[PDB]
Design a protein around this ligand. Structure first.
Ligand SMILES: CCOC(=O)c1cnn(C[C@H](O)[C@H](Cc2ccccc2)NC(=O)c2cc(C(=O)N[C@H](C)c3ccc(F)cc3)cc(N(C)S(C)(=O)=O)c2)c1
Length: 375
């Protein structure tokens, strides 16, 4: 036991359909399972019956609920919901030892948002006010917590793939990683926006201009499953990954996410697939570092004696998104007080006897401030 021990192992997931934490709302208490999302900024909960929900928030039974008299609507890349704004008291039983009064949206209708069998009933948006709906005067959950209490302006995340993990609020826990932590600056506070300066596939540089990697932004996002890439980058990376795994051919639909391939239980040939590295901007002029993932991170199991996989890198038209495929390799620190994000090798990542995920540096990279996109 270190001093954050009671927060270790406070996350669950069912069949790889989102990581969630327990939260307690209102008075007397109602406890619900809440999806953790660093790619949005609204706190919202289901508040009316739905065939995919086991329970929901009942405002009439809470004596501390206050009505803001205002509607709200939120569309994502996948799905959308509409509801009503209010405030109420909120705690996290396996989190920090405080209670705050927070904005909450009560979800009364939705389309392709809730997921059958996921076991979660609402979402906690952990990013900044600039992207909240209906606009930036609606204060997000993490801002309320820092402004009302002593808790330090920092949190960190360890997602353990195949489903559990930990969310540490107000500090770092040294048993959750090995080796050192390496930091990249947050470019601007809206999404958690970062700069990628080089890409390699099995040690071989892809050689695109670095402005293509960040067009029109690159972000770190725990509520999206895949690594998503801009059109011209997706096309050149798949060509290179096929060239490097050519001891077995696969149909074209596999690299598009439209076909699965299944091996007999225990026998998947991890070694025929290459490793992938991203280089990120560091904290000193002209210095970078690199993070490296394995096929165990970018091929995802779909839930007999047969192990079936889907290829989890895909095309985007709104910039690079480092989703759960990147985060399951690493312990990640969202250090909001010093405007930076830290990466270290995770103590729980999935690997084999020949290779492991890695975080290494320092490397020399010139002109990194050219790489970023301006409106
Ligand atoms: C308002 C200001 O913000 C925005 O405008 C805005 C617009 N988009 N966002 C990004 C947010 O983070 C939303 C939140 C959300 C959360 C839940 C449901 C719907 C939306 N995520 C997605 O949009 C999204 C979700 C999934 C998915 O399946 N997730 C499950 C929970 C999951 C499963 C396993 C895991 F390990 C981790 C997560 C797949 C895709 N893909 C497109 S994919 C196939 O990965 O390429 C996209 C913010």
């Amino acid at each position: 036991r270190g001093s954050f021990v009671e927060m270790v192992d406070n996350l669950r997931g069912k069949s790889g359909q989102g990581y969630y934490v327990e939260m307690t709302v209102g008075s007397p208490p109602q406890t619900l399972n809440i999806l953790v999302d660093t790619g949005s900024s609204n706190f919202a909960v289901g508040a009316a019956p739905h065939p995919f929900l086991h329970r929901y928030y009942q405002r009439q039974l809470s004596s501390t609920y206050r009505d803001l008299r205002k509607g709200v609507y939120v569309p994502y890349t996948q799905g959308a919901w509409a509801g009503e704004l209010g405030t109420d008291l909120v705690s996290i039983p396996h989190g920090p030892n405080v209670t705050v009064r927070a904005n909450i949206a009560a979800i009364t209708e939705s389309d392709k948002f809730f997921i059958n069998g996921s076991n979660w009933e609402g979402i906690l948006g952990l990013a900044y006010a600039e992207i909240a709906r209906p606009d930036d005067s609606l204060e997000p959950f993490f801002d309320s917590l820092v402004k009302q209490t002593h808790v330090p302006n920092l949190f960190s995340l360890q997602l353990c793939g195949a489903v559990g993990g930990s969310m540490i609020i107000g500090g770092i826990d040294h048993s959750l990683y090995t080796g050192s932590l390496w930091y990249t600056p947050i470019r601007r506070e809206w999404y958690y926006e970062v700069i990628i300066v080089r890409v390699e596939i099995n040690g071989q540089d892809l050689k695109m201009d670095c402005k293509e990697y960040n067009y029109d932004k690159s972000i770190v996002d725990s509520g999206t499953t895949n690594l998503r890439l801009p059109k011209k980058v997706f096309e050149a990376a798949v060509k290179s990954i096929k060239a490097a795994s050519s001891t077995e051919k696969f149909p074209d639909g596999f690299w598009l996410g439209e076909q699965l391939v299944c091996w007999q239980a225990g026998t998947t040939p991890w070694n025929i697939f290459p490793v992938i590295s991203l280089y990120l901007m560091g904290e000193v002029t002209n210095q970078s570092f690199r993070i490296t993932i394995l096929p165990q991170q970018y091929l995802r199991p779909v839930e007999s004696q047969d192990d079936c996989y889907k290829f989890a890198i895909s095309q985007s038209s709104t910039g690079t998104v480092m989703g759960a495929v990147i985060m399951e390799g690493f312990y990640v620190v969202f250090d909001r007080a010093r405007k930076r994000i830290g990466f270290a090798v995770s103590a729980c990542h999935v690997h084999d006897e020949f290779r492991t995920a890695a975080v290494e540096g320092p490397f020399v990279t010139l002109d990194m401030e050219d790489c970023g996109y301006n409106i």
